[PDB]
Design an enzyme around this catalytic site. Structure first.
Site, PDB file in Angstrom:
ATOM      1  N   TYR A  77      32.533  48.794  30.136  1.00  0.00           N
ATOM      2  CA  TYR A  77      32.288  47.361  30.227  1.00  0.00           C
ATOM      3  C   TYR A  77      32.594  46.794  31.382  1.00  0.00           C
ATOM      4  CZ  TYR A  77      33.085  42.224  29.889  1.00  0.00           C
ATOM      5  OH  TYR A  77      32.848  40.671  29.685  1.00  0.00           O
ATOM      6  N   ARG A  89      26.755  34.311  35.952  1.00  0.00           N
ATOM      7  CA  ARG A  89      28.201  35.477  36.238  1.00  0.00           C
ATOM      8  C   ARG A  89      29.081  34.538  37.209  1.00  0.00           C
ATOM      9  NH1 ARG A  89      25.413  40.035  36.265  1.00  0.00           N
ATOM     10  NH2 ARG A  89      27.723  40.708  35.336  1.00  0.00           N
ATOM     11  N   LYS A 116      32.673  42.611  26.248  1.00  0.00           N
ATOM     12  CA  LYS A 116      33.761  41.721  25.879  1.00  0.00           C
ATOM     13  C   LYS A 116      35.034  41.693  24.787  1.00  0.00           C
ATOM     14  CE  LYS A 116      37.113  39.410  28.548  1.00  0.00           C
ATOM     15  NZ  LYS A 116      37.477  40.196  29.843  1.00  0.00           N
ATOM     16  N   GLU A 152      33.448  33.963  28.858  1.00  0.00           N
ATOM     17  CA  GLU A 152      33.067  35.033  29.457  1.00  0.00           C
ATOM     18  C   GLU A 152      31.824  34.751  31.013  1.00  0.00           C
ATOM     19  OE1 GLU A 152      35.465  36.947  30.476  1.00  0.00           O
ATOM     20  OE2 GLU A 152      34.256  39.160  30.952  1.00  0.00           O
ATOM     21  N   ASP A 153      32.386  35.269  32.366  1.00  0.00           N
ATOM     22  CA  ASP A 153      31.126  35.126  32.821  1.00  0.00           C
ATOM     23  C   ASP A 153      30.444  34.326  33.359  1.00  0.00           C
ATOM     24  OD1 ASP A 153      30.384  37.047  34.911  1.00  0.00           O
ATOM     25  OD2 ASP A 153      29.550  38.053  33.755  1.00  0.00           O
ATOM     26  N   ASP A 181      39.357  34.208  30.592  1.00  0.00           N
ATOM     27  CA  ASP A 181      39.871  35.708  31.066  1.00  0.00           C
ATOM     28  C   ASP A 181      39.721  35.547  32.630  1.00  0.00           C
ATOM     29  OD1 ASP A 181      41.588  37.739  30.378  1.00  0.00           O
ATOM     30  OD2 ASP A 181      39.321  38.835  30.971  1.00  0.00           O
ATOM     31  N   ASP A 182      38.419  35.239  32.703  1.00  0.00           N
ATOM     32  CA  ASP A 182      38.182  35.345  34.145  1.00  0.00           C
ATOM     33  C   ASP A 182      39.618  34.577  34.649  1.00  0.00           C
ATOM     34  OD1 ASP A 182      35.384  36.848  34.627  1.00  0.00           O
ATOM     35  OD2 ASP A 182      34.695  35.155  33.751  1.00  0.00           O
ATOM     36  N   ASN A 185      36.688  42.607  44.494  1.00  0.00           N
ATOM     37  CA  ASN A 185      35.204  43.319  43.423  1.00  0.00           C
ATOM     38  C   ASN A 185      33.959  43.152  43.919  1.00  0.00           C
ATOM     39  OD1 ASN A 185      37.157  45.292  41.814  1.00  0.00           O
ATOM     40  ND2 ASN A 185      37.366  43.101  40.890  1.00  0.00           N
TER      41      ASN A 185
END
Ligand SMILES: O=C(Nc1cccc(S(=O)(=O)Nc2ccccc2F)c1)c1cnccn1
Ligand SMILES: O=C(Nc1cccc(S(=O)(=O)Nc2ccccc2F)c1)c1cnccn1
Lengths: 543, 543
Positions: free
Chosen positions: B86, B139, B157, B228-229, B251-252, B399
């Site tokens: 990942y 993103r 994922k 996701e993203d 999730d983010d 990050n």
């Protein structure tokens, strides 16, 4: 079921209407490509990788999903892809990356399965198999024993029959006969998956290989068995054992001599020095090197009906001691006697040891490099050949390029472009004074695929030497007036389908003349046969 | 049919007796391995590659042939394999190596298929789908728009739900909603296979995403939809649009806050400074950063029944202008108002701009790094926190590691090992004076798989904030006395199956207390439920 079957999957070449009808609209990204567009995309995906092994790994991924696209990519970029998909990359894949081959068809035999070989073949569930490539991983060149990891060699060679001659990829079977390994790293490697034992002795080796040949003759009766990358202790003896009883050949031995003989006779035609006027130094006196000389003499005898004894007298054989002669005082190995000079005194023999003095004495018009000891053809030696002919024929055939007798660049530079050069390996063009030269590559791909397609259609009882000599002549004759005027010794590699169709045609006609052909459905006249063979070839297009 | 089905294939783990019975003796090399032996071999095959992308490519090859062996290898080497399978390797695979994902399940939607979304899902031919991961490739961090190549993010994922929580790999569906791309390279790239157009405006974006949610609710009724993203212009609004009407989470947003809140409350316990005595600098004032602060306050309010208003007063929010206060003269963004200081004068606000002077004034016991602007937590700043507490809590969560506020090594060095550190990324241990320290990684894997398994078993009508807060608390409480005595803020990542079973258990009990659970077959008491959940998990062993 179509997307997940690599034989019928078209990937992005499915049209929108086809995706609608097959209920696969949401399974693909929306761009629709032609096959040529997919090939251009794959070629870019390959060249994104710098290392051959990573290019190879990418092509394996294509092959596992879209077999038609894989073979279309090879056919569009053949010269460039050959070093990746076979020698030398495939051997490095076998040696260190053997997992690349796990998902492929491979049939594995070993002593644990003695007496079950036919059951294992039946279990493989193939239909009318046409070509079986078998190795034991021992290596023709005796470097890097691969043991069980030799399966990747058989897989790669099978793939070349499909690309070269349109053998249907469903009708090729790659085989490993695991009779052990002398590879000490493997024998100690916790992750080696083969028979963890030194190579079996000859008696057991032949017990298992005999069961293999008999089982394959029964279960795969339509197939040609091709021995690939067997060590010299066995490869000649295997052919003596099986050539008459089974449909079989060895490409390393028989394919190589057929391809080099074809190219060499075209170099004679270009050189201005006719076959009986040639004085040929054969640098290297191994069984293979003498086989190539004898294949040249056989082809010239067929094409021109010169007495074969007079063609033998054009060869000057050089072993590690020097010029091979009947007078130099040693007991010659059997294969060296028939090319030994009878016309050189004991006193002259004693003074014919170094290649330089041998060349000064012999006054050769050709240097055949089959020596495997590096760059023996020096500037001084090439300059001496220019004294004997206007067009030196210089064939540095030792592999790899570091073992080679001379670079094509040096050969052309030292002769101001007069040298006629053939290589085992591909080289870039050389430009001298604005004139461009490029060596002719005697790739084994010119012959084995057409022999396979020929033997697949004619179903001969066996493959006698006549079929190889006919393939050799067919290849020689495919070099056009045009090809020859540009200095080429072979038809172009990119035209391999047409080449294979013609080789196969001539091989079939020879099988028909010998009454060894079992397939009586085939035309018996060349034009109608060649059309029939072309139609029978699998093509890497969607259908 | 067993060898070629990656779900049931055992490769070399088929015994000789099994190979005999299945008629596959000749299809495999002769060594028979256990699954642990195959995992050790695969782990060596992975580490033969130096670059993450080539490790990833090797693992794809395993997954395509032997799914059980792939997931067994991930479970045996999880911490080491996570950066490969990942973030950040999967994004580099998407961006430059998108062909790695072509053969995988992926369901592709775009405007060309408007009104056919339900038909496309029906066509995919899945049974009782449990987890669907969808992205548009925009993103979360807004770097490297992937467009259609975002399918690899969904694939990666999905794979983490299988590894983390034993979602059966047949019951996960990866989705790309291709609404265009602003990636200029892609828009000009002849080999880009997605919609060659800039990203659709909001009205059309929601027309298609609404059809997706409604189609999935009908065709995949048993599934959790996980966003996701998605970029910040949409990810918060998508959850406001769908959270009540569909079974969905992001999730983010929600996973990250649940994991950081759990670890932070364990850092408070270790620190000697209880929640109402903490003075927390929140460095970064984005919607996500304020969400994490609010998730901490919510968890402390649940676990300890402190009034949430008093927990809010422990936070000191720092945006690009300085300390967020009600007196500093600007019009605050809505998300910044609830954490704005009411206790700081206009005159003091004007003198609270640089992080150094803010830290000197606030006298914080915690530094939360959510800033995304590099190494703001200097030696001087860390040294000031040592004045306010014996155990500074220092969470550099920005990050990647180059955007991070401080290295764990510097945090431990500058505090002589007193700092309690959590990271977004893994770090090696640090040794100071023979004593070893290692930061706690707040990996999102702690929460989303257990939320997925919980929502798969309970089949709740929706995923209200209560289920995320319960998952957060469950994770916090899994950190054992032993874990805490060695300075760990989370249970160990290697124990992810037990972690997920417990998170899922607690999530189910919360769904049962709220009467939103549609699956009435489940136990309603914790011990019997946890046993039931463990039994329901897919395990990467041969059966
Ligand atoms: O074939 C599938 N997909 C596919 C997607 C894009 C492109 C191509 S492709 O076949 O056009 N090119 C290709 C395929 C492989 C590796 C390198 C490639 F370049 C195929 C598939 C097969 N089963 C299941 C789901 N998809
Ligand atoms: O599964 C097959 N073969 C296989 C051979 C050796 C070893 C393994 S393995 O499954 O043991 N390991 C493995 C497989 C993949 C890639 C990396 C691997 F390490 C499997 C097969 C499947 N279909 C057709 C013919 N063979």
């Amino acid at each position: 079921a179509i997307l997940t079957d690599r034989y019928i999957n078209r990937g992005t070449a499915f049209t929108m209407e086809e995706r609608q009808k097959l209920h696969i609209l949401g399974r693909l990204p929306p761009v629709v490509e032609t096959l040529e567009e997919q090939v251009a995309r794959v070629y870019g995906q390959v060249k994104k990788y710098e290392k051959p092994i990573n290019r190879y790994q990418h092509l394996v991924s294509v092959h596992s999903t879209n077999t038609t696209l894989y073979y279309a990519t090879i056919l569009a970029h053949l010269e460039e892809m050959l070093p990746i998909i076979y020698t030398p990359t495939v051997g490095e894949a076998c040696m260190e990356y053997s997992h690349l081959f796990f998902r492929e068809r491979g049939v594995y035999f070993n002593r644990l399965y003695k007496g079950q070989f036919r059951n294992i073949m039946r279990d493989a569930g193939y239909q009318k198999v046409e070509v079986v490539v078998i190795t034991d991983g021992s290596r023709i060149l005796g470097l890097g024993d691969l043991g069980s990891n030799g399966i990747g060699i058989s897989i790669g060679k099978c793939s070349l029959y499909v690309a070269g001659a349109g053998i249907d990829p469903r009708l090729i079977v790659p085989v490993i006969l695991d009779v052990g390994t002398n590879n000490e790293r493997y024998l100690q490697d916790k992750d080696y998956l083969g028979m963890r034992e030194k190579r079996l002795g000859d008696e057991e080796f032949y017990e298992l290989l005999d069961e293999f040949m008999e089982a394959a003759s029964a279960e795969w009766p339509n197939a040609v068995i091709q021995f690939e990358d067997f060590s010299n202790n066995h490869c000649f003896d295997i052919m003596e054992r099986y050539q008459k009883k089974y449909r079989c050949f060895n490409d390393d031995i028989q394919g190589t001599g057929a391809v080099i003989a074809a190219g060499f006779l075209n170099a004679i035609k270009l050189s201005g020095v006719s076959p009986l006027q040639q004085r040929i130094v054969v640098f290297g006196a191994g069984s293979a090197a003498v086989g190539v000389a004898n294949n040249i003499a056989a082809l010239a005898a067929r094409m021109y009906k010169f007495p074969v004894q007079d063609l033998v007298k054009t060869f000057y054989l050089v072993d590690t001691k020097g010029l091979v002669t009947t007078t130099r005082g040693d007991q010659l190995a059997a294969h060296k006697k028939l090319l030994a000079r009878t016309d050189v005194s004991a006193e002259d023999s004693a003074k014919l040891r170094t290649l330089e003095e041998i060349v000064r004495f012999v006054k050769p018009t050709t240097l055949l490099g089959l020596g495997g000891v590096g760059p023996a053809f020096t500037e001084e030696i090439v300059k001496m050949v220019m004294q004997n002919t206007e067009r030196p024929i210089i064939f540095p055939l030792s592999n790899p390029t570091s073992k080679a007798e001379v670079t094509p660049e040096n050969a052309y530079k030292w002769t101001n472009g007069a040298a006629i050069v053939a290589s085992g390996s591909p080289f870039p063009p050389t430009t001298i004074g604005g004139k461009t030269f490029k060596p002719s590559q005697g790739n084994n791909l010119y012959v084995f695929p057409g022999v396979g397609l020929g033997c697949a259609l004619a179903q001969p009882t066996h493959i006698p030497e006549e079929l190889l000599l006919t393939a050799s002549e067919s290849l020689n004759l495919l070099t056009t007036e045009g090809d020859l005027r540009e200095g080429r010794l072979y038809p172009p590699l990119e035209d391999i389908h047409n080449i294979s169709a013609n080789v196969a045609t001539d091989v079939i006609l020879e099988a028909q003349r010998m009454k060894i052909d079992n397939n009586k459905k085939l035309p018996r006249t060349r034009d109608e046969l060649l059309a029939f063979v072309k139609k029978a070839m699998w093509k890497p297009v969607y259908s």
